[PDB]
């Protein structure tokens, strides 16, 4: 359902990824 | 430019019909939703790439840089696969 | 090996009948005579998700050109993943469950998690 440990070559890139997407969500 | 964020989904929901048996329907839900893990794919990626650009002071992300970051991230087979095109579009 | 994801969590008929998309897709883009000015997917388009990354900044032809191939390509597995749970459920109509279902096959979609949880 939501996985600790997921991808080992993805996990980083996805974190950033919702960083990215929380400010694209901030600004609307 | 919030829109810029997705491919658009006539487009997308064609290549899905194309994936399918003739008979088959698919779903509104189910075209956004392919809509939204393809325009990710994209994202996805490119993040990767940007990223190792801007580290290595770079200013174009280039075909390599695509590819680089596909297999970085999992995609080998894909980052493989489009090799062949890169070098068959550069000759 | 380079092609572990082309199979990944398939089994059967459906293993088969991806693998053999993968060769077609591998024969196509080996092939001569590419037209790079036809896709599916429109080449400003793909190029407005990558410029959608404040952290990007010029990019060369090459990169949707690739992506195009790519998202077709993405697009077309990923359906045809989706499509066995269809069958399974003795269905005519692709659901989004089903895309969910065909996700948690391979750990090569953990991507998108945040997408279609």
Redesign the interface.
Known sequence: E??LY??A???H??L???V??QK?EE?? | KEQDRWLPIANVARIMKLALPENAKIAKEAKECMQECVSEFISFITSEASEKCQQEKRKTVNGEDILFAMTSLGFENYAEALKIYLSKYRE | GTWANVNQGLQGTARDILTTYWQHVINHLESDNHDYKIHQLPLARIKKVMKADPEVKMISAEAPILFAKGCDVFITELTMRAWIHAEDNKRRTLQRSDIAAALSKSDMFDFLIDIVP
């Open positions: 939501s996985p997921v991808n070559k993805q996990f890139r996805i950033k990824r919702r990215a997407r694209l600004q609307l």
